[PDB]
């Protein structure tokens, strides 16, 4: 149940947390050896893994799916690929954290699930926060330069980790514009 | 057998599912007090239908409490009544007379409601204003340090001996600091416009620091600085960028009136506008080192030379 | 004393194995005895890690033919070697002269992919593999879309790549 959660969380959903796409991860259900006290902590941790699997799926989906042949900048288009490029390297500390968790579980196996929860709760706010930006881009068919303002309006807020995390992505998608401007000028 | 017995050994899950647990111990009155009290009742002729208590051990009840107290919700013991934790009445260990028990768990449950409501405030933020987010971020920075100690205690239940009278005294410097939040937040949860909703919230904190002008004051101070962060950004931005830009009058100044910046507000407006007429032809990174080198009284009057000199620069 | 005795939030590596064994037994009962599972461990962790490192060389193990969550990690890292082989046999020649230069240029990357595995790791954890060979293994799979595995060749292929 312990190791299984880490494997599910990295993007390998187990036979305990069964991945559907209309509902994400789901526990197998009430059994007489389990009761809600651990269950709720597990569910709260499973939220972040739902989001993470969606992220990896989208980044994979829009980078490396054509040998590059219209008017499309949202099913295709260099800016979308630039966002997908930024997003995974911003997601690097999550992977680093999961890697850490396996080592701590190896050192002493009796460590609690709340032990996992408090370490991962620096991410518990930031992971809903970055989701609305990608959701905006996907839903409203935001393409070309318009992606920059979509990220930029939420990189003028009042939470430091959200600001830095979005800042790295905006550097990348600035980079494609700079590469075109550096020759055209 | 073969799975149920091996479970019964390793896993604890039997005092709240089928075959309620029976605890053999040292007997004779010094910790056999519950059974003596039951026999006393039975001699005293109720007479029939004994009191339903399912017999959970104590050290466990400590674990379930610490889980509830840390801030994760939805445990089977301690039912809700409207979202409020209340004591469950099947608990008995082998003593504690079941009445002092029902009071002491109620007291700690009352402290659990205080943190429950704050986590509820936050849980409805994950399913803009930008002051609410800074508020929640302050609460969390406190919360994680609180949860860490409890989480450490949970290992040490397996380890020594741990009992109620120890964990109550050990959590004394926290249960002091929770009571103030129950009063501060109770006016921060009681209210429409984003400018009165911001001023009324800032004003509670600004009042609470001058109220006691030492663990509570560090609490009020560190929640103070982490929530005035939007305002300071806007205060600098009106000056140096020569324009005002708000959410929807999300800034309490309008081109709704706290006294927090009143002794310099004129100098703010007369600088912010005067830059705009220059264009037509970092104060936060000062404030955060200011805390390193009276609180919100003389200290705030030492912030003001730095912004006064800047106004002087602009108008000149 | 008697030690509070491992909880679900608690102990792993033995209770974890016990738990997964029990859940598999639960599934087996809940069907009627008509669901059949393979071996629950294969065969260990570190031995399995060295086996999957050998899969990246280009030799797939004899457990493949053309815990239980191990399958989900395992398929993703397993398919990398099977497409590496699907590049190497379409690089076996000693026509298009520029096409032959193109094939040796493909070997310039395939040798790098064979060199990075088992010249770096002493031993790594199981999840380190799936994270580490993500930026590289997906990049390896990108080249299969490039190749046919007709198929334009010669100046036609050279000019498209230009």
XYZ file of C-alpha atoms in Angstrom:
663
model
C 0.000 0.000 0.000
C 2.989 2.246 0.720
C 5.284 1.601 -2.214
C 2.185 1.251 -4.442
C 1.227 4.869 -3.819
C 4.657 6.093 -4.924
C 4.447 4.025 -8.106
C 0.941 5.313 -8.817
C 2.057 8.863 -8.100
C 4.952 8.802 -10.569
C 2.556 7.782 -13.338
C 2.335 4.011 -12.971
C -1.156 3.481 -11.520
C -1.482 0.202 -9.670
C -4.195 -2.348 -9.064
C -5.001 -0.393 -5.887
C -5.424 3.073 -7.408
C -7.173 2.213 -10.656
C -6.731 4.862 -13.347
C -9.716 5.895 -15.350
C -9.714 8.999 -17.504
C -13.139 10.343 -16.532
C -12.165 10.064 -12.859
C -8.380 9.741 -12.498
C -7.205 7.474 -9.672
C -9.618 5.559 -7.428
C -9.066 3.267 -4.452
C -10.325 -0.300 -4.625
C -12.826 0.359 -1.837
C -13.695 -0.361 1.807
C -12.212 -3.658 3.034
C -12.379 -4.869 6.667
C -8.617 -4.307 7.144
C -8.753 -0.589 6.200
C -10.761 2.380 7.469
C -11.068 6.063 6.480
C -8.234 7.568 8.543
C -5.462 6.457 6.229
C -7.859 6.485 3.256
C -8.441 10.234 3.260
C -4.707 11.043 3.395
C -4.177 8.681 0.475
C -6.958 10.350 -1.544
C -5.581 13.832 -0.833
C -2.188 12.677 -2.049
C -3.803 11.016 -5.105
C -5.074 14.401 -6.345
C -1.509 15.525 -7.168
C -0.841 12.318 -9.079
C -4.002 12.766 -11.163
C -2.741 16.206 -12.157
C 0.785 14.895 -12.816
C -0.365 12.094 -15.135
C -2.464 14.595 -17.077
C 0.574 16.903 -17.377
C 2.921 14.224 -18.699
C 0.249 13.062 -21.140
C -0.225 16.568 -22.560
C 3.506 17.380 -22.784
C 4.112 14.061 -24.525
C 1.104 14.589 -26.791
C 2.175 17.944 -28.212
C 5.961 17.503 -28.433
C 7.314 14.841 -30.769
C 4.224 13.807 -32.715
C 5.058 14.984 -36.261
C 8.045 15.432 -38.549
C 6.479 18.894 -39.119
C 4.428 18.418 -42.316
C -2.127 25.203 -42.310
C -3.131 27.941 -39.871
C -2.901 25.959 -36.674
C -1.075 27.040 -33.535
C -3.063 25.004 -31.007
C -3.087 21.488 -32.401
C 0.381 22.384 -33.781
C 2.438 25.558 -33.770
C 5.822 26.344 -32.281
C 4.490 28.154 -29.193
C 2.524 25.145 -27.970
C 5.633 22.981 -28.264
C 7.573 25.679 -26.388
C 5.066 25.574 -23.501
C 5.285 21.772 -23.411
C 9.073 22.114 -23.315
C 8.959 24.503 -20.357
C 6.438 22.544 -18.309
C 8.416 19.335 -17.746
C 11.587 21.021 -16.489
C 9.474 23.072 -14.126
C 7.985 19.721 -13.009
C 11.467 18.380 -12.144
C 11.315 18.975 -8.305
C 8.247 16.697 -8.060
C 10.193 13.795 -9.525
C 13.104 14.678 -7.227
C 10.728 14.561 -4.256
C 9.289 11.130 -5.151
C 12.856 9.902 -5.536
C 13.590 11.160 -2.057
C 10.500 9.394 -0.626
C 11.635 5.999 -1.880
C 15.004 6.434 -0.141
C 13.423 7.445 3.170
C 11.038 4.491 2.991
C 14.077 2.292 2.363
C 15.896 3.619 5.434
C 13.072 2.962 7.899
C 9.926 1.201 6.637
C 7.677 2.255 9.531
C 7.300 5.863 8.342
C 3.760 7.206 8.187
C 1.682 8.398 5.272
C 1.351 11.751 7.042
C 5.136 11.819 6.856
C 4.739 11.815 3.090
C 1.896 14.314 3.237
C 3.737 17.109 5.048
C 6.741 16.941 2.741
C 4.561 17.002 -0.357
C 2.306 19.815 0.911
C 4.683 22.486 -0.418
C 3.311 21.304 -3.771
C -0.297 20.967 -2.579
C -1.077 24.603 -3.401
C 1.146 25.108 -6.433
C -0.242 22.167 -8.404
C -3.847 23.434 -8.606
C -2.432 26.878 -9.409
C -0.535 26.009 -12.587
C -3.481 23.945 -13.873
C -5.747 26.848 -14.821
C -3.096 28.274 -17.165
C -2.841 25.102 -19.267
C -6.617 24.724 -19.030
C -7.108 28.247 -20.399
C -4.764 27.556 -23.317
C -6.525 24.296 -24.191
C -10.107 25.458 -23.784
C -10.169 28.883 -25.439
C -7.970 27.806 -28.413
C -5.170 30.150 -27.430
C -2.363 30.106 -29.959
C 0.565 32.148 -31.150
C 1.596 35.090 -29.027
C -1.628 34.888 -26.962
C -0.182 32.136 -24.743
C 2.302 34.691 -23.308
C -0.364 36.989 -21.895
C -2.298 33.982 -20.580
C 0.708 32.998 -18.468
C 1.794 36.587 -17.803
C -1.399 37.758 -16.130
C -1.016 35.025 -13.539
C 2.702 35.721 -13.145
C 1.901 39.100 -11.595
C 0.197 37.660 -8.508
C 1.283 37.369 -4.900
C 2.640 33.858 -4.354
C 6.435 33.418 -4.885
C 6.546 29.708 -5.949
C 3.819 30.156 -8.563
C 5.632 33.239 -9.881
C 9.030 31.545 -10.267
C 7.524 28.334 -11.664
C 5.596 30.229 -14.335
C 8.643 32.441 -14.958
C 10.760 29.575 -16.295
C 8.076 28.565 -18.809
C 7.690 32.168 -19.935
C 11.439 32.257 -20.543
C 11.147 29.288 -22.944
C 8.178 30.610 -24.923
C 9.918 33.972 -25.045
C 12.856 32.057 -26.484
C 11.034 31.014 -29.638
C 9.982 34.639 -30.307
C 13.525 35.827 -29.675
C 14.863 33.233 -32.108
C 12.593 34.509 -34.891
C 13.268 38.179 -34.083
C 17.047 37.671 -33.916
C 17.149 36.907 -37.650
C 14.253 38.973 -38.969
C 15.575 42.235 -37.543
C -7.173 -18.367 10.318
C -4.257 -17.967 7.853
C -5.098 -14.417 6.906
C -7.294 -13.228 9.758
C -4.878 -14.404 12.454
C -1.840 -12.933 10.693
C -3.760 -9.681 10.288
C -4.764 -9.752 14.005
C -1.102 -10.039 14.877
C 0.398 -7.396 12.619
C -2.471 -5.068 11.736
C -4.424 -3.343 14.523
C -7.728 -3.317 12.667
C -9.962 -5.183 15.098
C -11.172 -2.847 17.825
C -13.529 -1.176 15.361
C -14.567 -4.053 13.111
C -15.798 -7.590 13.965
C -14.545 -9.235 17.203
C -14.175 -6.083 19.313
C -10.887 -6.200 21.173
C -10.326 -7.473 24.713
C -7.257 -6.203 26.562
C -5.707 -8.458 29.218
C -3.559 -6.571 31.696
C -2.256 -6.357 35.263
C -5.730 -6.309 36.823
C -6.830 -4.989 40.289
C -8.163 -1.446 40.410
C -5.171 0.747 39.657
C -5.756 0.477 35.954
C -8.771 -1.902 36.182
C -10.963 1.030 37.195
C -13.435 0.833 34.306
C -14.353 -2.766 35.149
C -14.734 -1.884 38.846
C -17.019 1.016 37.902
C -19.052 -1.268 35.642
C -19.395 -3.883 38.398
C -20.372 -1.084 40.780
C -23.115 -0.033 38.382
C -24.263 -3.646 37.924
C -24.446 -4.108 41.675
C -26.331 -0.809 41.881
C -29.097 -2.254 39.561
C -29.655 -0.122 36.413
C -31.079 -2.927 35.801
C -30.207 -4.326 32.442
C -28.784 -3.281 29.012
C -25.129 -2.540 29.833
C -23.452 0.550 28.439
C -22.160 -0.040 24.942
C -18.430 0.575 24.932
C -16.286 -1.189 22.373
C -12.935 -1.176 24.302
C -10.163 0.629 22.336
C -6.696 0.927 23.867
C -5.295 4.322 24.836
C -2.064 4.782 22.848
C -4.080 4.222 19.743
C -6.619 6.886 20.779
C -3.635 9.212 20.984
C -2.770 8.333 17.358
C -6.295 8.946 16.056
C -6.383 12.274 17.852
C -3.022 13.449 16.462
C -4.246 12.604 12.975
C -7.386 14.641 13.557
C -5.366 17.464 15.096
C -2.789 17.726 12.324
C -5.411 18.815 9.833
C -6.409 15.791 7.811
C -10.125 15.154 8.190
C -12.520 12.190 7.923
C -11.671 9.666 10.644
C -14.242 7.122 11.875
C -13.966 7.972 15.580
C -15.348 11.477 16.363
C -18.422 11.878 14.150
C -19.474 15.217 12.619
C -22.681 16.987 13.564
C -22.594 19.863 11.098
C -18.930 19.639 10.292
C -18.069 19.793 13.981
C -16.030 17.071 15.641
C -17.714 15.545 18.727
C -16.617 12.836 21.172
C -17.664 9.253 20.425
C -19.050 7.355 23.408
C -17.844 3.781 22.860
C -14.312 4.725 23.946
C -12.949 3.190 27.171
C -9.498 1.771 27.842
C -9.426 -0.010 31.236
C -9.866 3.046 33.514
C -10.640 6.807 33.076
C -14.252 6.327 34.410
C -15.881 7.249 31.002
C -17.017 10.677 32.283
C -13.751 12.561 32.754
C -12.934 10.879 29.440
C -15.947 12.395 27.705
C -14.874 15.833 28.945
C -11.167 15.691 28.113
C -11.709 14.409 24.581
C -14.306 17.136 24.159
C -11.742 19.784 25.142
C -9.185 18.527 22.656
C -11.937 18.180 20.029
C -12.779 21.833 20.619
C -9.188 22.617 19.763
C -9.466 20.377 16.705
C -12.432 22.371 15.410
C -10.259 25.509 15.415
C -7.765 24.012 12.990
C -10.582 22.199 11.094
C -12.231 25.465 10.158
C -8.998 26.968 8.842
C -8.349 23.915 6.699
C -11.955 24.278 5.509
C -11.226 27.892 4.528
C -8.272 26.611 2.556
C -10.020 23.551 1.041
C -12.596 25.755 -0.569
C -9.698 27.670 -2.251
C -8.562 24.531 -4.108
C -12.154 23.523 -4.896
C -8.402 37.025 -8.354
C -8.325 38.446 -4.833
C -4.615 37.690 -4.069
C -4.946 38.646 -0.417
C -6.751 35.393 0.397
C -3.929 33.410 -1.214
C -1.308 35.230 0.902
C -3.454 34.588 3.985
C -3.631 30.852 3.221
C 0.119 30.749 2.538
C 0.794 32.241 5.976
C -1.555 29.724 7.620
C 0.209 26.885 5.843
C 3.692 28.020 6.816
C 2.473 27.807 10.388
C 0.568 24.590 9.756
C 3.423 22.468 8.444
C 5.621 23.231 11.455
C 2.692 22.313 13.679
C 2.049 19.052 11.831
C 5.718 18.017 11.885
C 5.902 17.699 15.672
C 2.668 15.655 15.841
C 3.921 13.414 13.036
C 7.127 12.852 15.000
C 5.118 11.935 18.126
C 3.272 9.271 16.142
C 6.430 7.224 15.662
C 7.215 7.528 19.354
C 3.914 5.938 20.303
C 5.503 2.631 19.146
C 8.574 3.573 21.185
C 9.180 4.860 26.345
C 5.547 5.374 27.254
C 3.135 7.977 25.880
C -0.137 8.949 27.551
C -2.782 11.655 27.536
C -1.360 13.638 30.437
C 1.990 13.838 28.652
C 0.707 14.839 25.222
C -1.524 17.527 26.694
C 1.357 19.259 28.463
C 3.620 18.752 25.479
C 1.117 20.460 23.167
C 0.633 23.350 25.631
C 2.624 25.904 23.536
C 0.469 25.077 20.523
C -2.965 25.017 22.197
C -2.077 28.472 23.477
C -1.496 29.700 19.933
C -4.710 28.175 18.507
C -7.045 30.114 20.800
C -6.019 33.467 19.325
C -6.752 32.280 15.779
C -10.215 31.216 16.862
C -10.919 34.821 17.820
C -9.066 36.549 14.979
C -10.610 34.399 12.247
C -14.122 34.602 13.723
C -14.292 38.210 12.558
C -12.478 37.302 9.339
C -15.192 34.778 8.438
C -18.047 37.154 9.306
C -18.845 39.684 6.600
C -19.542 42.343 -0.591
C -17.292 44.768 -2.452
C -13.668 43.678 -2.785
C -12.502 46.918 -1.168
C -14.447 46.558 2.087
C -13.678 42.830 2.143
C -9.980 43.658 2.022
C -9.988 46.572 4.476
C -11.993 44.716 7.117
C -9.603 41.784 7.004
C -6.412 43.875 7.162
C -7.895 45.902 9.983
C -8.388 42.875 12.258
C -4.679 42.067 12.114
C -3.611 45.703 12.428
C -5.752 45.955 15.549
C -4.570 42.643 17.007
C -0.888 43.612 17.014
C -1.469 46.931 18.787
C -3.688 44.977 21.225
C -0.682 43.438 23.002
C 1.968 46.017 22.127
C 6.147 35.782 23.906
C 4.831 33.257 21.388
C 1.519 34.826 20.399
C 3.034 38.095 19.206
C 5.437 36.236 16.904
C 2.383 34.443 15.569
C 0.493 37.675 14.885
C 3.630 39.260 13.421
C 4.458 36.464 11.015
C 0.886 36.236 9.860
C 0.967 40.009 9.499
C 3.906 40.334 7.133
C 2.841 37.445 4.863
C -0.548 39.099 4.214
C 0.437 42.738 3.580
C 2.481 41.581 0.560
C -0.136 42.584 -2.131
C -0.521 46.082 -0.738
C 3.185 46.895 -0.701
C 3.547 45.759 -4.313
C 0.738 48.067 -5.360
C 2.175 50.933 -3.270
C 5.489 50.667 -5.077
C 3.857 50.091 -8.477
C 1.790 53.284 -8.402
C 4.968 55.250 -7.736
C 7.548 53.902 -10.092
C 5.420 52.846 -13.052
C 3.536 56.145 -13.023
C 0.092 54.567 -13.189
C -2.390 52.763 -10.979
C -3.547 49.293 -11.931
C -5.957 47.330 -9.762
C -7.981 44.161 -9.971
C -11.397 45.765 -9.506
C -10.407 48.326 -6.823
C -8.773 45.292 -5.220
C -6.463 47.917 -3.676
C -8.112 49.672 -0.756
C -7.111 53.078 -2.131
C -9.489 54.434 -4.778
C -8.739 57.253 -7.192
C -12.205 50.948 2.326
C -10.061 53.200 4.555
C -7.607 51.515 6.884
C -5.403 53.604 9.147
C -2.400 51.374 8.457
C -0.827 53.766 5.972
C -2.667 56.959 6.971
C 0.372 58.947 8.294
C 1.937 58.790 4.794
C -1.099 58.374 2.490
C -1.007 61.945 1.219
C 2.663 61.532 0.258
C 1.674 58.338 -1.534
C -1.030 59.919 -3.673
C 0.970 63.062 -4.472
C 3.880 60.906 -5.679
C 1.920 58.285 -7.629
C 0.125 60.922 -9.635
C 3.195 63.143 -10.135
C 5.135 60.360 -11.859
C 2.363 60.017 -14.479
C 2.848 63.624 -15.525
C 6.564 62.984 -15.929
C 6.011 60.003 -18.206
C 3.655 62.059 -20.388
C 6.469 64.316 -21.629
C 11.882 48.234 -4.603
C 10.015 48.980 -1.380
C 9.096 45.364 -0.635
C 12.786 44.490 -0.971
C 13.415 47.249 1.521
C 10.656 46.210 3.968
C 11.772 42.615 4.273
C 15.326 43.518 5.455
C 13.753 46.093 7.795
C 12.421 43.290 10.001
C 15.953 42.006 10.630
C 17.435 45.212 12.012
C 7.568 49.138 19.361
C 6.236 46.686 16.799
C 4.040 48.363 14.142
C 4.370 51.551 16.176
C 7.884 52.945 16.097
C 8.940 50.334 13.581
C 6.393 51.450 10.998
C 7.510 55.049 11.496
C 10.976 53.863 10.461
C 9.631 52.564 7.150
C 8.405 56.048 6.310
C 11.738 57.919 5.684
C 12.478 55.585 2.779
C 9.159 56.235 1.057
C 9.223 59.937 1.998
C 12.579 60.437 0.276
C 11.159 58.739 -2.810
C 8.143 61.072 -2.837
C 10.558 63.989 -2.476
C 12.474 62.666 -5.490
C 9.299 62.386 -7.598
C 7.913 65.815 -6.794
C 11.334 67.432 -7.299
C 5.315 -3.805 26.485
C 3.963 -5.282 23.350
C 4.672 -2.797 20.440
C 1.526 -1.181 18.806
C 2.101 -3.659 15.786
C 2.372 -2.410 12.151
C -0.459 -0.304 10.784
C -1.403 0.516 7.200
C 0.314 3.913 7.467
C 3.259 1.993 8.947
C 5.541 -0.825 7.817
C 6.424 -1.903 4.306
C 8.690 -4.384 2.465
C 7.029 -7.261 4.346
C 3.553 -5.925 5.136
C 3.574 -4.403 1.652
C 4.240 -7.841 0.142
C 1.657 -9.298 2.509
C -0.886 -6.646 1.493
C -0.499 -7.165 -2.245
C -0.651 -10.950 -1.772
C -3.891 -10.579 0.207
C -5.458 -8.245 -2.357
C -4.587 -10.650 -5.166
C -6.218 -13.452 -3.183
C -9.259 -11.199 -2.797
C -9.529 -10.721 -6.570
C -9.095 -14.483 -7.107
C -11.955 -15.244 -4.723
C -14.170 -12.449 -6.058
C -14.209 -13.877 -9.551
C -14.868 -17.540 -8.799
C -11.370 -18.790 -9.409
C -11.259 -18.006 -13.138
C -8.828 -15.065 -12.947
C -5.193 -16.132 -13.240
C -2.171 -13.981 -12.422
C 1.515 -14.467 -13.245
C 4.321 -14.575 -10.683
C 3.888 -11.609 -8.308
C 7.594 -10.835 -8.131
C 9.948 -11.147 -11.066
C 12.171 -11.999 -9.373
C 13.463 -9.329 -7.037
C 14.154 -5.593 -7.397
C 17.928 -5.257 -7.988
C 18.105 -8.362 -10.174
C 15.104 -7.033 -12.099
C 16.864 -3.666 -12.415
C 19.925 -5.285 -13.974
C 17.638 -7.318 -16.266
C 15.896 -4.203 -17.564
C 19.290 -2.558 -18.025
C 20.146 -5.475 -20.293
C 16.901 -4.876 -22.195
C 18.266 -1.418 -23.124
C 21.351 -2.991 -24.699
C 19.176 -4.558 -27.384
C 18.634 -8.049 -26.003
C 15.154 -8.461 -24.627
C 14.769 -11.034 -21.895
C 13.097 -14.415 -22.354
C 10.187 -13.189 -20.219
C 9.062 -11.218 -23.296
C 7.589 -12.513 -26.559
C 6.697 -10.916 -29.886
C 3.659 -6.203 -6.162
C 1.572 -6.036 -9.344
C 2.110 -2.418 -10.346
C 5.535 -3.439 -11.710
C 3.870 -4.150 -15.074
C 2.946 -0.477 -15.501
C 6.530 0.686 -15.006
C 7.833 -2.320 -16.890
C 5.985 -1.934 -20.194
C 7.137 1.678 -20.598
C 10.802 0.806 -20.111
C 10.424 -2.505 -21.985
C 9.256 -0.975 -25.254
C 12.389 1.217 -25.537
C 14.631 -1.744 -26.347
C 12.159 -3.219 -28.813
C 12.205 -0.044 -30.868
C 16.001 0.237 -30.492
C 16.156 -3.154 -32.183
C 13.704 -1.859 -34.747
C 16.242 0.771 -35.658
C 19.301 -1.481 -35.614
C 18.074 -4.026 -38.133
C 17.220 -1.132 -40.478
C 20.855 -0.113 -39.995
C 22.530 -3.424 -40.764
C 23.884 -2.785 -44.302
C 27.601 -2.202 -44.970
C 20.798 2.507 -52.702
C 21.744 6.171 -52.416
C 25.224 7.088 -51.237
C 23.899 9.932 -49.107
C 21.374 7.402 -47.775
C 24.262 5.212 -46.637
C 25.890 8.238 -44.969
C 22.483 8.814 -43.341
C 22.429 5.214 -42.034
C 25.883 5.544 -40.450
C 24.779 8.856 -38.939
C 21.931 6.935 -37.334
C 24.539 4.551 -35.916
C 26.218 7.615 -34.360
C 23.184 7.923 -32.056
C 22.403 4.225 -31.547
C 25.920 3.677 -30.235
C 25.458 6.586 -27.830
C 22.237 4.984 -26.595
C 24.017 1.691 -26.098
C 26.902 3.476 -24.348
C 24.888 5.475 -21.807
C 23.332 2.376 -20.242
C 25.735 0.163 -18.255
C 28.655 2.493 -18.324
C 26.991 4.899 -15.911
C 25.069 3.034 -13.153
C 26.394 0.900 -10.315
C 22.811 0.290 -9.155
C 19.755 2.530 -9.191
C 16.284 2.271 -7.794
C 13.481 1.030 -10.021
C 11.744 4.402 -10.425
C 15.016 6.207 -11.237
C 15.092 4.225 -14.459
C 11.620 5.285 -15.546
C 12.325 8.919 -14.773
C 15.864 8.981 -16.183
C 15.162 7.287 -19.530
C 12.112 9.495 -20.159
C 14.003 12.418 -21.721
C 16.076 9.922 -23.724
C 13.835 6.935 -24.480
C 11.005 9.028 -25.890
C 13.696 10.770 -27.920
C 14.706 7.325 -29.186
C 11.091 6.619 -30.138
C 11.016 9.925 -32.053
C 13.400 8.452 -34.612
C 10.996 5.624 -35.471
C 8.489 8.152 -36.752
C 11.338 9.572 -38.830
C 12.189 6.241 -40.430
C 9.618 4.158 -42.246
C 9.844 1.713 -39.381
C 8.301 3.095 -51.008
C 9.883 5.252 -48.242
C 11.603 8.369 -49.714
C 15.357 7.949 -50.019
C 18.349 9.533 -51.721
C 18.068 13.214 -52.663
C 14.363 13.158 -51.774
C 15.031 12.192 -48.158
C 18.094 14.448 -48.034
C 16.096 17.455 -49.251
C 13.230 16.823 -46.823
C 15.767 16.640 -43.996
C 17.366 19.809 -45.416
